[PDB]
């Protein structure tokens, strides 16, 4: 046992790509809040859990808060919940089991959820021909947004 007051903090890091994980993203939604994950197919995949981690409960896809396991899932989406969130803080644990037993657990991965634009409305009537004026905005006062099509 060298176990000790020794700081040495060995890597590990990160390895880039050609096996099998999951990732977490949240895109091409609605007007209403979501999430989403993406998963890399295998042999034999299995349970992969996830979880908030806060002193109260950020999000929830239940009434209270809530975990969501699923197995063999390779691309869905899930919803979340209210409170004042800016970017929540989920903990996913994949246990793949493609070999007798691989683990990727506890990609401590913080996802954001907020709009990125914001958009205001007005209407102009005239007799029988009907026009919009769409105010567009970003939502944050100091990051910009750019734009590929309306």
């Known amino acids: 046992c060298k176990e000790s007051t020794k ?8 390895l880039n790509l050609g096996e099998y994980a999951l990732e977490l993203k ?7 809040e979501s999430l989403q994950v ?20 950020d999000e929830i896809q ?6 969501t396991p699923f197995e063999n899932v390779r691309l869905e989406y899930y ?3 209210q409170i004042t969130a800016f970017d929540l803080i989920i903990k996913t644990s994949f246990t793949k ?16 959820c907020y709009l990125q634009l914001s958009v205001s409305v007005e209407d102009i009537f005239k007799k029988d021909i009907f ?4 105010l567009l905005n970003s939502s944050v006062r100091e990051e910009p947004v750019i734009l590929y099509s309306s």
Not at 100 to 106: A, K
């Open 97 to 112: 089991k493609n070999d007798q037993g691989t683990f990727g657990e506890t990609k401590k991965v913080r996802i954001q």
């Open 7 to 14: 700081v040495l903090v060995k890597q590990a890091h990160n």
């Open 38 to 57: 993406e998963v890399e197919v295998q042999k034999n995949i299995g349970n992969m859990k996830n979880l908030p981690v806060s002193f109260s409960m």
């Open 62 to 67: 239940a009434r209270k808060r809530y975990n």
């Open 26 to 32: 949240s895109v091409q939604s609605d007007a209403l």
């Open 131 to 134: 026009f919009f004026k769409f």
């Open 79 to 81: 919803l979340l919940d």
